[PDB]
Structures are given as C-alpha cells and as structure tokens.
Amino acid sequence: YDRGVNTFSPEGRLFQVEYAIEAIKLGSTAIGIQTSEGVCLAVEKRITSPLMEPSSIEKIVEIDAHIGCAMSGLIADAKTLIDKARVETQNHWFTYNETMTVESVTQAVSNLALQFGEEDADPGAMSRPFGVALLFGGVDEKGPQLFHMDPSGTFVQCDARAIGSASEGAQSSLQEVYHKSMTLKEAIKSSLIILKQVMEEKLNATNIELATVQPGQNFHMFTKEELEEVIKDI
Amino acid sequence: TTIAGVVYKDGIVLGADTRATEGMVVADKNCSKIHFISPNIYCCGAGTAADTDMTTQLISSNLELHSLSTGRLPRVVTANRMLKQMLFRYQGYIGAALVLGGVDVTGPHLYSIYPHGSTDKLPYVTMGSGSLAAMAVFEDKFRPDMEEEEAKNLVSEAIAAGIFNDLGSGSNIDLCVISKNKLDFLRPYTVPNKKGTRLGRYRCEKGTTAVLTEKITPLE
Amino acid sequence: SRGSSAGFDRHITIFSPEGRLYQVEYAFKAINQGGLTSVAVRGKDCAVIVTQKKVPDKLLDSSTVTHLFKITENIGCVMTGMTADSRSQVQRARYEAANWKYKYGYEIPVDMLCKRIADISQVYTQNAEMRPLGCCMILIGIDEEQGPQVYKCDPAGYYCGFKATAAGVKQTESTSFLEKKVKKKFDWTFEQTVETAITCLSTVLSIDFKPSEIEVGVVTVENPKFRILTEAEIDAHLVALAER
Amino acid sequence: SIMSYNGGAVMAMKGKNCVAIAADRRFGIQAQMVTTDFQKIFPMGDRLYIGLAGLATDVQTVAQRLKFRLNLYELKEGRQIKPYTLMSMVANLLYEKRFGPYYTEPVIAGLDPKTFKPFICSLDLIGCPMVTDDFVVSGTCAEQMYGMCESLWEPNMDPDHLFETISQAMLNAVDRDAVSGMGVIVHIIEKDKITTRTLKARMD
Amino acid sequence: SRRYDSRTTIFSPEGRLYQVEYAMEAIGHAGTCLGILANDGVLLAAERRNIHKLLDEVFFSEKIYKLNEDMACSVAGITSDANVLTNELRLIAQRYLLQYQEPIPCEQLVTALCDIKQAYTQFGGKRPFGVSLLYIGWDKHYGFQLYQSDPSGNYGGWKATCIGNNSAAAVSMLKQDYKEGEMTLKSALALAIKVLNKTMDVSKLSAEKVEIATLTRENGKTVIRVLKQKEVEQLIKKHEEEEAKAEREK
Amino acid sequence: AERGYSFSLTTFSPSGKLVQIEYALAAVAGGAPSVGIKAANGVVLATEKKQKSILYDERSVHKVEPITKHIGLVYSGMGPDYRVLVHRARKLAQQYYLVYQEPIPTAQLVQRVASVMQEYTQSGGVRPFGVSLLICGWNEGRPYLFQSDPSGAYFAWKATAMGKNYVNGKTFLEKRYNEDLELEDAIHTAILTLKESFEGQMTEDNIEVGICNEAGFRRLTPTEVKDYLAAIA
Amino acid sequence: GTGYDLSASTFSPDGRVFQVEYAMKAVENSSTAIGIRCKDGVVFGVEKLVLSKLYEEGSNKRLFNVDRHVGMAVAGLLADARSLADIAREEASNFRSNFGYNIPLKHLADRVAMYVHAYTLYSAVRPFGCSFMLGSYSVNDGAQLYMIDPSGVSYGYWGCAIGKARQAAKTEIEKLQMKEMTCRDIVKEVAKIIYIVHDEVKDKAFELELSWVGELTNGRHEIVPKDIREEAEKYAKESLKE
C-alpha cells in the first residue's frame, strides 16, 4: 500500500507533519534569547570548505525594519515563507499605516505552513509540508517578543529557545542561564557560550551570525568586527 | 433576389432568380440561390449572400450526419428545427432568409424562416427583395393541389414578375422540382433578356500597351 | 496467457493478456443478482413484455416495485438486475428521448433511443474511473416505417434488435423455449403473442401465475400508446391458458 | 469606407487556355503616397495566384495567414492545391471572423493542376464565393473596371491577345481613380509558363 | 486513485528515468535509419520495416516525412507516435514562418520539438514518446545540417549517425569510412549502401528494402527528391562490382 | 464524481513493448474474420455476421457502415469500440467537408481516425480501442484500402484479412490475388477467402458484402449476395 | 477481499459491490427508527438512545424537516444524514421555484435516490452510510412513505423500519393493522412497538421521538405535542408488562 499526504496515524498525528519535524533535527542550530532590552538571534553558518564564501550563506533575514528571523532545517523551503511574510507586513502597512505586531506576522505564515493537497486542490498548492523552524524576534508595542514556529503550523511565544540539530543539549543549558533580569549584553554572551558547546566546528567571527533587534533601533546585523568584539569575552 | 415556393399535390417547386447585387452594381449575372441540403430537401437563400451559404452548409452537414445514423432519409421538420434554433441563438445578426422545402414520407412541407428564428409553415411563400412582386402573382393564380405542369409555369411566372418589378432581380430563373421519385433541378429555365451584340469591334492587337519590363518563368 | 491475471486488469477496465475485459464479464453476473426474469416477444401487430413481480413483504407496497417504465408515450421498457442502476439508466433514457424530440421535432425511433443509451454505457467500459452500470434494459415500441420493434442493450453496450428475448437469471432456459416456437411460425395475433410470453415464463420457473405475480406491458399497432395491463385484463389471458 | 483607406485594385480575366490577373501598386495613406511598389498578388503554388485589394493591414495578414493554412495543407496531404478548394478555404478564413471582419476582397485566379481548366472567382469581405467565367474584379475602382471589361471581353482569346485586353482595361480603369495607379503589374498564366509584365502608366 | 497509478515522472534510486530508458528499447529493435552528411547535399537512408507483396506503396515514403519546404525527417520507433510529432513539427515550422516571414532555421525547429518531449518526461504522468528522428535540412546560417533526437528530450548534431537496430554496428562502420571535410554526394550514396549490407539480414538488399532521399541545393531553392527504384538499383548493382574487385588482393 | 484519472495506463515495459496495445491486438485477432480486396476498379469489403440463434434480427445492425458517399468501414474486435470510431469518423468527414467543400479524401480520413485511436494510448485512465478498421474508398480516380490498428498506425493494402484465422486468410490471398482482377470477380474471391475461416453453411444473412467503386460505397442488398453465393448471374 | 473492496468502482467476481454492502452495516449499528403509514397521515418513531446525563434531552435529533410537509427519519452515521437532509432541502426548495407548488413525495424520493446512487459509481467518493425514510401527507395524493438505502433503491412502504433491530420490529408491524386507523390511534401503537424491540439490557435508557404529518396538523410536519407523547409512553409501559 501507499498513503497520500493526508493520512492520520492510529496514534493521532499526520504522517507528513511528523516527518517534517524530524527534518529539523538535521539542520543548523539557532539560539534566540529574548530580554527586556531586545531580542538577539545567533546561528551557526555551517560552512563545508574554505573555498565556500562564508558571507553569502546567511540564515538571519530582515522581515521588516523591526522583525528578524532565523531559520534552521531545509533552507530552500524557507525562501517561500520569508518572502510571504515581507509581503505580509507590507500589505499590512499599506492598509493600516502602522507596523505589524510580531505576533500577527507569525500567525499569517503559520496558516500557509499547513495546507497541501494530493488531490482536489489548486495547481499551485504545495505537495508537501515545509521543512523549517523559524524564530521571529521583533520589537513592537508589547515590548520585545520572540516566537517559535514549527512545521506543524503552530506557534508558541517564548523567552529563550533553541531549534535545530542540537536542540536538547542547548535547551537544558538555557534553563540554567536564563533569568528575567538578563540584559542584552549578558544575553549575547550567554548565546555564544551555549553555541560554542554544541558546534562541532569552532567559534569564529565567520562561523556565526549575530543580529539583534532593540526597542531603540531597527533590525541590525552584526558586521565582522562586532563579532570579533564579543568573541574576546567568550 | 426573389425566392418563391409552391406546394402542389405531388411535391414542391422552388424558384429564384440569379442576379446578385453588391451596391447598385450587379456583381454576378449567374448565382444559384438554390442550395442542396439533403437528396430530398432544397433551400433557397435571400438576404446577405454570405450568411445563408454558411448557414445552409452547416445544416447540410448536421443532416448528412443525422441520416446515416438513423439510416433512413431525413424529414423536413428536422432541418426546420435546426435552422430555427441556430438562427435564434444569434438574435438576428445572421441575416439568412430561408425558403426550406422538402418531400418526406409524411407529405411535402414548405417553411419560410426569417432571420430572428421565426417559422411560418405555409402552402406558398416568397422571400427576397421583389418578394412582394411575387406574392401578388400568387394571390390570383394559385389554387390548391394543382397539376405538376400548372405549377412549373406558376413559379416561373412569379419570379418573372419579381424580376421586372425589381432592381435586385434579373437574368435567369432557376427552378427546382422536388417530388417523391425524381429531382429535376434545372438551373437555366427561362432567360427573359440577354445581352445584345457588340455592334463594332473595339479590341486591339499586340503592340498597343507599353511594357516596362517582363520576364518568363517556365515550368514543367 | 489464457485466463491469466497481469497487473490491475481484474479491478479496473483495462485489457488482459488473453484479450478480455473482466470488469465487464463481471457486470453481467450482476444482472443475475436481481433474481428476476423478463421475456419480451414480438408480434405481427404488437410487442409484449412480461415480468416477475416479487413483493417479499405485505408492508412493501406492490405498485411501486414495478419494472415496466414508460420511457415516452410510444416507448416502453423493462429493467432487469441491480435495481439502483435500473432507475439511474431509465432517468437517462427518458432524458435523451425527450431531448431528441426537442432538437429534431418528432418522436424518437426505438432503434436510436437504445443506440444512445448503449453509447453512454460504453463510455464507462473505456474509462477507469467507474464501473459499468449493472443492469440490462429492453425497449419496445412501434415504429411507423417498419412495424413493432424490440431492442435490448447490455452493460458492455451491444444492443441488437430481436424477435423474442429474455434477460436475467433464467436467460438460457427462455431462449431455448422461445426459438422452437419461432421456427413453426404461427399467425402471431395479439392474443397468441401475449400467450407465448406468459407460457414461456411459466414453464421456465414452473409457477403458473396469479395476476398478482406478473405485470404485462404491451404496445400495439392500432394503439401505439405504451399501456400497462391491469390485473383484471391479465387474468382474462391467464384463464385462457387453462382452457387451452 | 475603411478600404478606400489604401486604394488598391485587382482584376482577373479568363481567356481560352489561360488566365490573367492584374493589380496596381500604389500603397498610400489616404492621399499621401508612401511607395509605388507593394505587392497585392501572391503566388499560392505555381499556376494559381490570389490577389487581395483593400486595407493594407488585412491584405498582409490574410496573405500571411493563408500561406500558413495552405502550406500546412500541401504537406499533411501530398496533393497540390486545386483552385476550387482554395476558394472555399479562403471563404472560411474570412467567415471565421464574421463579427469584426477583414477588409479585403480576394480574387483567386488559377489553372487546375491535374488538368488546365482556367478558373476565377472573387469574394465579398465576409466570405462569399462568386464564380464567373467572364472576369472578376475587386477593389475601389470596382465600377470603372466593370465598365471596361464588359465591353472588351471576348469569349475566347489567345495568350498574347488576352494580355492586350487586361492591359487596356486596367490602365483606363485605374486612371479614372484617385487612390490607385502608379503602374500596374500583370501576371498571365499559361499551361507552360507564367509571364509577368509591368505596364508603363501614369505616374500622376 | 493512487493504487492504480504507475508513476512515470519519478526518479530511480540511481538517478535515471525508467520510462525513458525503456523507450530506448522500443527504438533499439525498430527499423534501421542512418543519415550521412556531405558538402553538395545530405541524405537519409532508412530500412523499410514493412515489406511484403500486398502493400500498395502509394506513399511518398514510409519513413520520410517532409516537415517544411526545406527540411525532412526520418523516424524510428513506435509508428503511432511518429504521426503525432511529424504533424506537430509541421505546425511549429509554419508557425515560425507566420511570425518571422522566412523559413525556420534547422537547429531551432528541433529544439522546439524537444521542449515538447521534455515536458512529457517531467510532469503530466503520461508515458513518453517512444520515437527518435533524424532531421536533414538547409538554412542560411550553417548550410546543410543533420540532427538526431532521443525520446529523452535530448538532441545532438551529427555529421553521420544511426538509430534503430544494429545502430552500434553501423556507427562503427561509418567511423572508419567517413572522410571529414571532404565528401561528395556520390560518395555518400556509395557509403550508405555499404553500411546497409552490414546491418541488414539480406546481404544483397533489394531496391524494395531501402528508401533513400537526398536533399540538395539547386538554384537557391531546396530540392528533396526520393530516389526512384531505378536509381537505387544502380547503387546496389554498382556495389556488387566494388565487392567483385575487393575479392582480388592476390 | 471523478475528475478522471490523468496518468496513462499504457506504459512501457523493460523490453520495449506497450503491453496494453499488445493485448488489444489479441482482442482483434479473436473477432469475426473479415477480408478486403482492392480490385484496381473497386474495393470489396466482406465480413461474417453470425448470430447465436434465430432470435436476433439482421436488419438492426451492420458491419459495413458508410462514412461518406464513398468511404466504408468494416471491423473485427469489440462492437462497442467500433461504434465509437464510426461516429467519430463521420464527424471528422463532415467537419472536413464543412471547411474545404470537398468530400474528405481517403488518405486523409485514415490519418485522422488513426490519431484518435493513437490518442487513447497516451491519455489518462483510458484503454486502447479493441478494434481494427478496414477503410476502403474511391477518390481521385483510384481505389484505396487501409487498415488502422489499435496502436494508431495504418497500412495501405491491395488485399488483406483480419480477425479470426487471419494468418490463414493472409496467405490464401497472397496466392489467389492477381492484380487487374475484375470488380465482379473480386467478390467471388472475397466470399471465397472468407469461406476458409468461416464455419457452417453460408447464407445471405451470414455475410455482409460492401463494394466501393466510382459510383460510391454501398451495401449489397441481401438479394445480390444470394446470387454471388450461388454463382449463377 | 483483495482489491475487491478498496474501490466503489470494482465489481466482485460474484457480481456484488462490497463497498455498497459495507455501507449497509453502518445502518445495522445504529438504533432503530420505524415509520407507519395510516390512512390519513404518517407517524415516525425513533429509538434515540440516551448515552449520558451530559446531553440536553430533546436534542441530537434524528427527525428532520426536509420540507414543511415532509418528514425524514434517519438511521446510520449521522454526519451523512445531515448531509442528505441538506441536498433534499435544496432540491425541494429548487422544485418550488421552477414549478410553483410543493414537491410530490414520490418525486423527491427519486431525486434523492439519484443523488445517493451517483456516490456508488466513483473512486472519488464512498457510498453514504445512511438509510432514511421520507414521509408526507397531502389531501390530493394521500399518505406516502418511501425509504431509501445506501444502494440508492427506493420503494413504497405501508410500514418500514431501519436500524439494528429491523427484523424484530417488521414482524410486530405486520400483526398491527393500519389501513383503517387514524393518526390518533396509531401513535400509541408506534410507541408500543419501540418499547418491545428495544433492549434496556443493551442500552442505559432511551427517549421516544414521535412525529405527525397528516390530517391533524393540516399536511404540515411537526413533532408530537408533549401531552400526546406522555400518553403514548404511558400506554406502552402498561402493554409491555402484560
């Protein structure tokens, strides 16, 4: 026998979605910590040769001038959701003339995230679910927020989350370092310490990407000398 | 054009003249207005000459198809009901004006179909531009269930009267006799007036129109 | 080859290695499912149908089980087999034979009606998305250019015209009995055809009916309206089988 | 109309074993002439010409869309095209666009390839087959050319004498029209050879 | 339903298209068809797959379709699908003429076909066209050209090649005998007959086993004639003398 | 209700066959035998029309359908699938006659019908037609005989058989056929070569014979066939 | 079966279509509903099982209005029942627009069978797991009661039952005469049949749902007033002890 893409397991959960969840456990590692002074997103730009240009494989994007996003898993699928969000925050700004709250953009890309149809569907619908996890981390009018989003098309707000291939070892190490008084400078060092354990490469000013979003600034990605400036302290 | 039909006791006689006028200038001095639908159903077309051709031809091809499948000859009723429901679908821009008349195994029938999809089953009809000129001849000299030969001379008589009292009509008179055993479709029948003879010679002989160039392409 | 399976040829309607279509051979075994038999005999001035009427209960109303349907004013039929498919194909019959009159202006021949009903059925044989309808229609009616006619289409789609036929379970016992009485050639009046039909069903089931167990649909040249005989008139012909 | 908008004139004249077809060449925008060489006659396989007068745009589309439906019929079947068919193929390409017509009147002038029987017919702009045996014309000098042919035609001409007549009847017809002239060209098809002579005329 | 579906537009675990692989087998055991390029023309010879003495032979040719007024092609494979692609080629090539008003360049014609073979391999879940073709033509950017297309959706140019049974043995024969940059239309015909003896069962051939059609340029127009049975016989009868002189080496 | 299946059911096998078209041919070769003889003057199509009883009627159905006023069919294979191709052909013929105002040539009407049969070996959810056609016709001064296979190819013959025992009939014809046979004399040759495969006595109801000369295709009425069986005219 | 039951598009080597027969069992696993046609109307009885004290009594109905003068009583998978009831509603509203009167019950029966039949021919669908009965009174046609099953077959009935105890209750209806009683007399005998065929050893409890449609109400379909329902349940407990 063979089962289509819409089939519940006797367990209770959809086959395809159960497997999209395993597709993350191959991906990069990303650790976002959310504080009272802003959200910081750190990820590892897993290179594979020295020939590869480390500066053209980024996995933090600007969704708008106040909503960063760091994905891990199948980066090729991601370029379809991300583009749909930028279009989403913009449409929203075209009608209401304000920024979109970070909660609502997470919600619009999560509707897209579950809807595929072997039969009885458009010609442009997706044949399978998306193999990504995202970490939207903007600042808006409820203060800084951070949202985790999984290929099941569900989203839960967070405080500090790790996704990817080293989620378990990083998640335990987050529960012991994260408290509510944490500042944005203490948080960036907490990220790279936990990231430095779980990377089986090495910490280097081209092997990570660091970007913040702060209530007083826009989305700002750290250049290469501002990464070197925070690897001295680690 | 003048079209006319009569029913006599054995069949039908469809007549029409042959002139076709494009403007106030005769375009064709011989032009059959009598189109073959089936082996036993002719139809005459007035109005825009190009709209009747492509309406009758299309029906002919749904009647030729239709008869092979039933495997018997096709009725006049049927062609009448196809032309009516095709023309009605275009709400009158198809300017066909049809005198449909065949002989079935339920007697001769004779319909007239006006552009708009209206039907009028009758015993003698006239369509065309000198149609009125013809309808007068029929009001005197028509009597029910006449001889075959009294009819032939009636319908030519009505088309002749439509020829002389009209500008859109002239030249030969076509007759079609449909009966349940023969089909005497005779294209010349009467020729009221012919062109006269050139009284002199106006032609000229080679060496009279200047040429600039010329070139010969031989074939095989 | 020779009676061999090869792939999905016993589930959908594709060819098999020996050359047959098993999803159609199978639809015929569904005609014998219904457990009904219907004879239709042609005469020199009429055509006849006679059917078994079976009401398992006395709750079931006896008058809304029937298998004689008026297709139009001049075209009766009799549906044999899987009853759901029956009504579905009679719906489609009525529809065409009425559509016909709309596009040509005269009552449809019984010939053609069946042609077009068979042509809809064949389409199911050649596509793989559906099974053929599991029923078998018999049409009767009086043409005016060739007398009384009997046609009978199949789930494969092969209506041929007949002089006398049956359908259903006991189909082989009936054609045996009939063909001996088509070689003698009687005078086949109205009375002798209604007689041949009843006594052909009676001996193949071995019943001898009461007027409540058969229903007779008949169509004549004096009166081309498709009539269904009432239980009073059916019993007059049944007590005349007892005398003879 | 909007087919006096470019002038044009085509005339085809049946001889005895030969058929002639003549056009003028002046392509102009109402009054202002653009060029004096602009073909209104096209070959459609040898020994079969179609001429198109009228609106210059539909001239070229009809000639290009007819070469695309003729070439595809002359390959998919091997038989070369027969002139009585080519007429009905053109009647059907105009009537394909009944509503929103083309503004051209074709003039088909060929010999049957299997035999040699000459053949001429014009068409109304919506697609009507008008077969004669005298001579057909279409254009904007319609009235003028009818006059000239009705008096110079004769039932049987040799191919040298035919060319004198079509020439006489095309030079005098196009001279009495504003929006035509600037020289006429004349094919005259015989069984063996196709002659193409250009007449010296008014460069008025 | 997915139960009855035969996925035909899906990769193999080794990175192949099974349906395209099997299409090669339908062409492998089909009628032979070679074409050899020259300078004074170019010609398609092909085995006549069907032979008998009840066939009527009232065709232009069994294998050679004329695509344009400048291009022909010979097929090899499932005759059913040939009648489709040769009529969809004629439509491409007249459609290029309606739009550019000039004949279609020989290269382009073929690629526009093989965008249609390509599609049937990548989505639709249809079976692919089980035919391969040769094209001979003449254009004004390259002169004479020969091309060959696979049911893969893949085309190549060639100066001589062969599809259909024993194609391997043919191409080996051609690769010794073909002289590069020099070759007249009379030497290519005598080379063609020499390769058909080697591929065919009957080692003398007949005039009825082959059909040879050249495409020359004669006076600006292109000419594509299929040689009569008299011309072809003289190429077979003159090849029996080349073997009566090749038996002498002592 | 289904949109239809889209995937093809004809498909290649590792050897290079289109297994479905292979089986369709075996349905054909199980059918009622039929022969064709082009008589350099006319074409003759004959086929056997045996029934399972005396109950059937013979003036209900025919195996010699006319397509135009000079093109006839016969077949062997599946009587349903045959009635579909007959109908499609008549629309093609008429469609053609509507656009060129000529009657469809027979070379043309074989390619057009062939393509339809071809199309059903490459569309979704369908099987091939279990039929082969013999398409005689008298166009352009000659006769013609073709034969369309469930594959979608065709061949122009001067004689042939098909259906039951076509290997026996094809060799009987290869021997007993001489070009420039008369049209009358072909009819004797047709019914003759149809007599080998056939079983039982011949009558005027058992064979359908249809000629095709410059006068047009037609069926021979049961009376004419009774004088060909005897051979007394 | 092996491939002889996956699809609705596959005849069995018998001639049977197991997917239509399998839908029949979904009716056998549902409680009973009986319909009894008297001479001046119809009466519908549904053995609705009460499964918890968490459900509001007088809800989760199985008696519908397909039109203002037609009842429908269902047995089987309720989801499909609420799907059929909207196709009918739609059909009988449709009919009132184009023909301008109430749709005769004999006809509505056929249209809804048609629509049920079309779901036994394709792979894209499964048959309905739902049987039902249509009941209607007019003063120009009489009382009528049709019953449609997954196959798509309709028949007329004088009395009909569907559900897990269709055998037992058909017998108890055949003892009853009906061609001479009025509604007021039958409604008590319906309730009585239901109590006899129901098991209080297989089910906790049950609620008896009764429906007129007849001369009493003026051809309208309506549930039975609370008063006549209490009387018909009281008359059924006494005849059950005896």
PDB file of C-alpha atoms in Angstrom, chain B residues 6-9 123-124 137-151 154:
ATOM      1  CA  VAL B   6     -45.309  26.478 -54.117  1.00  0.00           C
ATOM      2  CA  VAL B   7     -46.759  23.201 -52.945  1.00  0.00           C
ATOM      3  CA  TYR B   8     -48.669  21.186 -55.480  1.00  0.00           C
ATOM      4  CA  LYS B   9     -50.123  17.736 -54.977  1.00  0.00           C
ATOM      5  CA  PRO B 123     -48.527  26.401 -48.861  1.00  0.00           C
ATOM      6  CA  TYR B 124     -46.664  29.062 -50.884  1.00  0.00           C
ATOM      7  CA  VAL B 137     -48.864  36.706 -58.756  1.00  0.00           C
ATOM      8  CA  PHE B 138     -49.616  34.005 -56.179  1.00  0.00           C
ATOM      9  CA  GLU B 139     -52.773  35.656 -54.865  1.00  0.00           C
ATOM     10  CA  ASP B 140     -54.520  35.496 -58.231  1.00  0.00           C
ATOM     11  CA  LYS B 141     -53.259  32.337 -59.838  1.00  0.00           C
ATOM     12  CA  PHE B 142     -52.775  29.826 -57.000  1.00  0.00           C
ATOM     13  CA  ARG B 143     -55.295  27.043 -56.479  1.00  0.00           C
ATOM     14  CA  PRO B 144     -54.847  24.093 -54.092  1.00  0.00           C
ATOM     15  CA  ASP B 145     -53.392  20.810 -55.320  1.00  0.00           C
ATOM     16  CA  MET B 146     -52.703  21.758 -58.924  1.00  0.00           C
ATOM     17  CA  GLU B 147     -51.000  19.790 -61.694  1.00  0.00           C
ATOM     18  CA  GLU B 148     -47.239  19.362 -61.842  1.00  0.00           C
ATOM     19  CA  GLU B 149     -47.090  21.458 -65.020  1.00  0.00           C
ATOM     20  CA  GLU B 150     -49.504  24.180 -63.916  1.00  0.00           C
ATOM     21  CA  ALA B 151     -47.093  24.745 -61.001  1.00  0.00           C
ATOM     22  CA  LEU B 154     -46.772  29.448 -61.932  1.00  0.00           C
TER      23      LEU B 154
END
